Amino acid sequence: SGAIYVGNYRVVNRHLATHNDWANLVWEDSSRDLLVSSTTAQGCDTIARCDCQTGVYYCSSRRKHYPVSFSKPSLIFVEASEYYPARYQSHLMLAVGHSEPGDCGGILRCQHGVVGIVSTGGNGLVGFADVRDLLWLDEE
C-alpha cells in the first residue's frame, strides 16, 4: 500500500484505488497502472523534474529502504499477475531488488523529490511507475 500527496492530488496504483478514488477521479491510465484522485486537504510531497537513474525505494515486506540504480521510463513486457493479464506496461522503470505484491505503493525518490511508485516485481527485479512526466501534478 502507498500513495503520493501533491497539492490537491492523490496518486495511487490503479489496481489499489478505492471506491472513493473512483468517485473523485481526475485521470487514469491502465497501461501505466496509475490513478490520480482529488483531495480536500493540501499535500506536502514534491515531484522530481529530472532524468535521474539513481535513488532509494521503500520495501514494506522487509521494513527497509534500499538504494538502487534504475533504467529510464520505457515500454516493457510484464507477465500476468492477480490484477492484469500479460501485456506491455508503459512508462516503467526497472531495478535489481526484493519485492512482493503488497509492496506496491512504496515510493522511489531521488535528490529532486518523488520519482515514482512500486508497481511490478519478480525474478529479483522491482518495477516502478514513473510520475516525472506528469507536469500538471504541480500546476493550476
Active site residues: 15, 33, 104
Q: How far is the CB of 29 from ligand A1BRH (least distance, A)?
A: 12
Identify residue 30 by its one-letter amino acid code: S
Q: How far is the CB of 132 from Zn ion (least distance, A)?
A: 8
Complex with ligand A1BRH: residue 50 or 56, whichever CB lies closer = 56
Site for ligand A1BRH in 68-127 (CB under 6 A): 78, 81-84, 89, 99-101, 103-104, 118-122, 126
Does 59 belong to an annotated binding site? no
Residues that bind ligand A1BRH (CB under 6 A): 15, 33, 78, 81-84, 89, 99-101, 103-104, 118-122, 126
